[PDB]
GROMACS .gro file of C-alpha atoms in nm:
model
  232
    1UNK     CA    1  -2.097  -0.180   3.335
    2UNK     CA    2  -1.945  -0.537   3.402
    3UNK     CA    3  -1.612  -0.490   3.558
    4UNK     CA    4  -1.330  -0.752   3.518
    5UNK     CA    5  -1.083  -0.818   3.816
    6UNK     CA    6  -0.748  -0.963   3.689
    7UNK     CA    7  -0.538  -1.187   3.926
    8UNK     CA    8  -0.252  -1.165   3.978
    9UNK     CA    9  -0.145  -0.770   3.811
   10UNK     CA   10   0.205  -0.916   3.782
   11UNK     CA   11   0.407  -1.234   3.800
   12UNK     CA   12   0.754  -1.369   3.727
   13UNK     CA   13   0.850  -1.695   3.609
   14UNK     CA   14   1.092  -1.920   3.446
   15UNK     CA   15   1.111  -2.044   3.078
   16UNK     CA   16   0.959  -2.373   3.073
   17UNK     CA   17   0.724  -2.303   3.363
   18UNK     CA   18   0.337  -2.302   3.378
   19UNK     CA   19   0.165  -1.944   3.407
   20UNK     CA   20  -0.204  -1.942   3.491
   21UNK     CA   21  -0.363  -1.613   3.524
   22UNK     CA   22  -0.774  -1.571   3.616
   23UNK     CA   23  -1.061  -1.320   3.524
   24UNK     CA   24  -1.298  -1.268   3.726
   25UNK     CA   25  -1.613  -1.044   3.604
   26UNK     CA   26  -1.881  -0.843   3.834
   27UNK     CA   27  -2.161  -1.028   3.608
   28UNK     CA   28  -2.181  -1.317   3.388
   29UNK     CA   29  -2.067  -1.341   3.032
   30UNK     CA   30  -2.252  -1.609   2.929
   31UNK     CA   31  -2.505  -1.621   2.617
   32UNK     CA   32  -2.672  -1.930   2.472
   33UNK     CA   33  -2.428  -2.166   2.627
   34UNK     CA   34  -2.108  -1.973   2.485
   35UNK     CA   35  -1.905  -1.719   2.741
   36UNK     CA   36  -1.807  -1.381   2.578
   37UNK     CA   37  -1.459  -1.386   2.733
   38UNK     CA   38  -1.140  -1.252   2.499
   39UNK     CA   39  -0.770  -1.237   2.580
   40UNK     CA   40  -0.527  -1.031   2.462
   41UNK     CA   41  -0.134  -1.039   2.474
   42UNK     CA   42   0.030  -0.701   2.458
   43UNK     CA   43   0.428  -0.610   2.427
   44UNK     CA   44   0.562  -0.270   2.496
   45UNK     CA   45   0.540  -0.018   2.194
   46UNK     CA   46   0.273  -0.258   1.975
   47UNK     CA   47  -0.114  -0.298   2.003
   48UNK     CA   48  -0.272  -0.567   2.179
   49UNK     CA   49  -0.312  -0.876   2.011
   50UNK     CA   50  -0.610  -1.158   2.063
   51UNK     CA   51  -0.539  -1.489   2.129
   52UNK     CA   52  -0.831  -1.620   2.277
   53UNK     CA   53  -1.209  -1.564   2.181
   54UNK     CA   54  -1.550  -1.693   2.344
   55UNK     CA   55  -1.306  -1.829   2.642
   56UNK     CA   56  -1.166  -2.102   2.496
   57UNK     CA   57  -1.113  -2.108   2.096
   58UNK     CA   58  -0.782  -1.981   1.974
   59UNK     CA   59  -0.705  -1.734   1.718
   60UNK     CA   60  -0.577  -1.834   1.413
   61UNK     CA   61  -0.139  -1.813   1.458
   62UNK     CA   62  -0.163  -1.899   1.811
   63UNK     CA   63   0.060  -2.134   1.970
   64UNK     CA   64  -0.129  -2.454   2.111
   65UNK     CA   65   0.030  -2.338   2.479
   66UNK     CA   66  -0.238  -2.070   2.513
   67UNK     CA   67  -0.578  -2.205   2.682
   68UNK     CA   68  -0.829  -2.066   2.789
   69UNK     CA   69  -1.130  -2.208   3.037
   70UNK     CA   70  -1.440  -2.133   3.231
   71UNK     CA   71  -1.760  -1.976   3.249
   72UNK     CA   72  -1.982  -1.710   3.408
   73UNK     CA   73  -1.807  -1.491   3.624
   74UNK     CA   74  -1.472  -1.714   3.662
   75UNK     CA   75  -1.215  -1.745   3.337
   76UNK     CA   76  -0.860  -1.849   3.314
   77UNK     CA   77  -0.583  -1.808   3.065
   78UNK     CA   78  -0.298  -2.096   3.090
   79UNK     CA   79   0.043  -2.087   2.949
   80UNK     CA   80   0.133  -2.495   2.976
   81UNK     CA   81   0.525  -2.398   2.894
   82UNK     CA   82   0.625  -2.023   2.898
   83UNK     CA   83   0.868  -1.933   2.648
   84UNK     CA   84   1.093  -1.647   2.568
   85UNK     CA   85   0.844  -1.473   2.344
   86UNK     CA   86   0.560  -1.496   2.632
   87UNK     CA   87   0.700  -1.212   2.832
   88UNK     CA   88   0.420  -0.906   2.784
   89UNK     CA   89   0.115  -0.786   2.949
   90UNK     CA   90  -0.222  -1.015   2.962
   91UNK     CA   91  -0.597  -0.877   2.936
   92UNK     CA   92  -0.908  -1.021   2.970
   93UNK     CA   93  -1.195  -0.858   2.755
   94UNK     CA   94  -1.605  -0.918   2.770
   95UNK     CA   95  -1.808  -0.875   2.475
   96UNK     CA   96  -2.113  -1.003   2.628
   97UNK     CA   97  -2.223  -0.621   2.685
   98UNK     CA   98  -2.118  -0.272   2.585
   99UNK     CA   99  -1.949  -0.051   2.713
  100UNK     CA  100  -1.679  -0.394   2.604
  101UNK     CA  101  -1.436  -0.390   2.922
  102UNK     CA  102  -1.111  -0.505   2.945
  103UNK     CA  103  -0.915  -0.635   3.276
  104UNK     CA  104  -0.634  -0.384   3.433
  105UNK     CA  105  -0.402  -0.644   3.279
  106UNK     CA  106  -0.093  -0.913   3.401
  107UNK     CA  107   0.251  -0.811   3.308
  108UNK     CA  108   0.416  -1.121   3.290
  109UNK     CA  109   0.802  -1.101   3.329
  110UNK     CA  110   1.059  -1.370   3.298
  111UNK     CA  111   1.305  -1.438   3.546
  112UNK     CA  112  -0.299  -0.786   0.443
  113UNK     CA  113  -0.479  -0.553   0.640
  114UNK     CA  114  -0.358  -0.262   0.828
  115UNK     CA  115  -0.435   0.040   1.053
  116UNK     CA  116  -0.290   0.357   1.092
  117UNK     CA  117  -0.420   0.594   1.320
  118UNK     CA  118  -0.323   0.992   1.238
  119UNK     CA  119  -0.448   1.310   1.428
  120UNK     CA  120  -0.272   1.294   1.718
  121UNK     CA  121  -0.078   1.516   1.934
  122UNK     CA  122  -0.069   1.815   2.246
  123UNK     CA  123  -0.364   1.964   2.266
  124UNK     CA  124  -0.489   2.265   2.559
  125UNK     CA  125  -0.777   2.106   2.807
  126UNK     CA  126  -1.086   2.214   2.669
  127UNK     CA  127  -0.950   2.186   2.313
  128UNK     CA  128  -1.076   1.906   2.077
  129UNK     CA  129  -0.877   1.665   1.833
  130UNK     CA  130  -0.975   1.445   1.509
  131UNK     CA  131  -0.862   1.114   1.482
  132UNK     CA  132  -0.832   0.965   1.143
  133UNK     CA  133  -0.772   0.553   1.110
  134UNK     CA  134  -0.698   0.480   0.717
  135UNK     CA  135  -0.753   0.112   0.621
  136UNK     CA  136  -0.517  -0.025   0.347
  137UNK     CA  137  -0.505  -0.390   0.242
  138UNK     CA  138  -0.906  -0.411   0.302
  139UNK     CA  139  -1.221  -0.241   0.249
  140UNK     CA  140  -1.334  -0.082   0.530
  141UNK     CA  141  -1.717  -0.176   0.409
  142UNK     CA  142  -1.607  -0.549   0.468
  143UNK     CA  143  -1.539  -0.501   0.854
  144UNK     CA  144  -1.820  -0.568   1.063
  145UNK     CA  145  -1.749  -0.295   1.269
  146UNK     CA  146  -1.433   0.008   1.377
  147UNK     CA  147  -1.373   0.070   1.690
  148UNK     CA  148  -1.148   0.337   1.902
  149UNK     CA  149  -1.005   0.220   2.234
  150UNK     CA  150  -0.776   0.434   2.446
  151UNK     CA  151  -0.528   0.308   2.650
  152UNK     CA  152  -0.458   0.582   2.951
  153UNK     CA  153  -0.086   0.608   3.052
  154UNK     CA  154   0.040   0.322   3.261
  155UNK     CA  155  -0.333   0.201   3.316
  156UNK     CA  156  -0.662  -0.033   3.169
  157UNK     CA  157  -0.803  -0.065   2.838
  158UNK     CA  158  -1.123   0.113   2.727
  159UNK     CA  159  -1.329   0.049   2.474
  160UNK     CA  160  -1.489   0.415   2.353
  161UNK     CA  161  -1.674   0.388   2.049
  162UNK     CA  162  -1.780   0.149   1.687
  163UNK     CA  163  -1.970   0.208   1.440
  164UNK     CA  164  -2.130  -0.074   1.216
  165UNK     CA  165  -2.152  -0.191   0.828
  166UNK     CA  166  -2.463  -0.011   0.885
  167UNK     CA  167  -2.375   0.330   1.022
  168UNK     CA  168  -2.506   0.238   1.379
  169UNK     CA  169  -2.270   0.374   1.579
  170UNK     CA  170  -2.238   0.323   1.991
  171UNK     CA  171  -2.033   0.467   2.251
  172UNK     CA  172  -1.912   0.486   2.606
  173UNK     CA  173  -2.125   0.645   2.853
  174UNK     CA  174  -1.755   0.762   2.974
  175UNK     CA  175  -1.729   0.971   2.713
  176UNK     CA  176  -2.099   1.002   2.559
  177UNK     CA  177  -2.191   1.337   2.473
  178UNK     CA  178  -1.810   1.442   2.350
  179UNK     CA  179  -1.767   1.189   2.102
  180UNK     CA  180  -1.886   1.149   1.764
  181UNK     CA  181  -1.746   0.829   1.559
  182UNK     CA  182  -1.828   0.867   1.157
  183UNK     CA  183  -1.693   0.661   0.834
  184UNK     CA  184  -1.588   0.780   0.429
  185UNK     CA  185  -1.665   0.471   0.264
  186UNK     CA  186  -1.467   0.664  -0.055
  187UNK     CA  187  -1.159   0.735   0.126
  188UNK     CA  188  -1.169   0.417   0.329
  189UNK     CA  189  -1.159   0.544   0.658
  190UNK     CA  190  -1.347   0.601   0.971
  191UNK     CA  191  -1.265   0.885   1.240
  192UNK     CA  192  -1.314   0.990   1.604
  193UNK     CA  193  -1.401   1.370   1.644
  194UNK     CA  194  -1.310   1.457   2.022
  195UNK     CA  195  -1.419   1.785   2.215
  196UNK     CA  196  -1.384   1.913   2.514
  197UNK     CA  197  -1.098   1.744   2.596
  198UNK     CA  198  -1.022   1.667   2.985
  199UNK     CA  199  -0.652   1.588   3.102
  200UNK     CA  200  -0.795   1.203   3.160
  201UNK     CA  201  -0.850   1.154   2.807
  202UNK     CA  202  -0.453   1.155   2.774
  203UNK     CA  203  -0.405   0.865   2.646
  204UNK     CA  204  -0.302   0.594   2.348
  205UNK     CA  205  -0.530   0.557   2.087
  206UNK     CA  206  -0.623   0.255   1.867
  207UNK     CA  207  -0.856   0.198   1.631
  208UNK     CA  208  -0.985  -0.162   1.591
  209UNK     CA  209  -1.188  -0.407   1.388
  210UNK     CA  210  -1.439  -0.591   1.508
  211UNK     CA  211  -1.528  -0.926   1.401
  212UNK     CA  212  -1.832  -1.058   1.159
  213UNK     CA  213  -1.816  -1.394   1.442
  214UNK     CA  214  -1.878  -1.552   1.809
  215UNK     CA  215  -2.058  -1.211   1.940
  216UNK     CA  216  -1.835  -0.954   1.703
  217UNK     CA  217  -1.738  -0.747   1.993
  218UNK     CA  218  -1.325  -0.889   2.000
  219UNK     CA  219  -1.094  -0.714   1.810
  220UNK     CA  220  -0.858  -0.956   1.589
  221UNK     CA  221  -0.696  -0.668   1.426
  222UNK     CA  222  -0.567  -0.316   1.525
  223UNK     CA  223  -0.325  -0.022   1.453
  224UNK     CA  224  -0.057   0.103   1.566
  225UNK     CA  225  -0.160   0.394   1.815
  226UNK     CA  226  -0.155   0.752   1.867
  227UNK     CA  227  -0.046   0.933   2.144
  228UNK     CA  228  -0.316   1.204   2.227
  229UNK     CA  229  -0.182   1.466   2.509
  230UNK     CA  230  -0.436   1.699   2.677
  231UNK     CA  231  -0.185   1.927   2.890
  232UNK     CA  232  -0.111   2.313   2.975
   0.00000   0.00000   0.00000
């Protein structure tokens, strides 16, 4: 399980100024000369979104301020002039490997296809939930793969589970053994069936696509979230 240490967790600046953050991961991300490195930009209420795949190419929409550089272990995301709409949270991703791992983030404070995610809600430890993600604007048998990723309150991002065009599906070893990701092609959704919950599966859940591209394993596009509560 390659682990990503993010540096520094939180920073303030000015408008105008440079911001570099790093990544540094517990094993190297590099494959056939390329470096399986994502970042992702995240205000507060919304998904994450990806602005930088394979270390250093930019996603389509992205302003020419965000860079990103390096290789193996050591990557860096550089703001040249921070503007207004730069203040949010930063995380490095690795798709070199699953389980795909994502940094513990840098808040960074100054001075068509959709989702939706249903199913949510309080549910008693030990209970289980059902997680539905309806795709609209797309076939979901065009995505090269869905993914769920939870975001625990307050804390990292985890990848938990994708399944394929093909049906292969793949999951955390977190979770393994609780989890069961399936797809209805005719309804054009996919779903996460959850039992046994524990209180540290409280968390926000998103459902992702992956891309057909540079490894597959970023996620370009995502919904909006639902808040799953295990409590007494």
């Amino acid at each position: 399980d390659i682990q990503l240490t993010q540096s520094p967790s939180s920073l303030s600046a000015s408008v105008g100024d440079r911001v570099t953050i790093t990544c540094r991961a517990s094993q190297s991300v590099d494959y056939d000369g390329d470096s399986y490195m994502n970042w992702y930009q995240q205000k507060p209420g919304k998904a994450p979104k990806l602005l930088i795949y394979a270390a250093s190419y930019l996603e389509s929409g992205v302003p020419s301020r965000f860079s990103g550089s390096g290789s193996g272990t050591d990557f860096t995301l550089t703001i040249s002039s921070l503007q207004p709409e730069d203040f949010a949270t930063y995380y490095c991703q690795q798709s070199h490997e699953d389980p795909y791992t994502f940094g513990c983030g840098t808040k960074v404070e100054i001075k068509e296809v959709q989702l939706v995610e249903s199913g949510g809600g309080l549910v008693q430890p030990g209970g289980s939930l059902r997680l539905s993600c309806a795709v609209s604007g797309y076939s979901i048998t065009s995505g090269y793969s869905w993914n769920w990723i939870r975001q625990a309150p307050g804390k990292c991002l985890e990848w938990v589970a994708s399944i394929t065009y093909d049906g292969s599906t793949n999951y955390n070893p977190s979770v393994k053994g609780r989890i069961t990701i399936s797809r209805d092609d005719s309804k054009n959704t996919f779903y996460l069936q959850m039992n046994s919950l524990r209180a540290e599966d409280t968390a926000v859940y998103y459902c992702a696509r992956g891309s057909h591209y540079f490894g597959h394993w970023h996620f370009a596009v995502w919904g909006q979230g639902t808040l799953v509560t295990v409590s007494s």
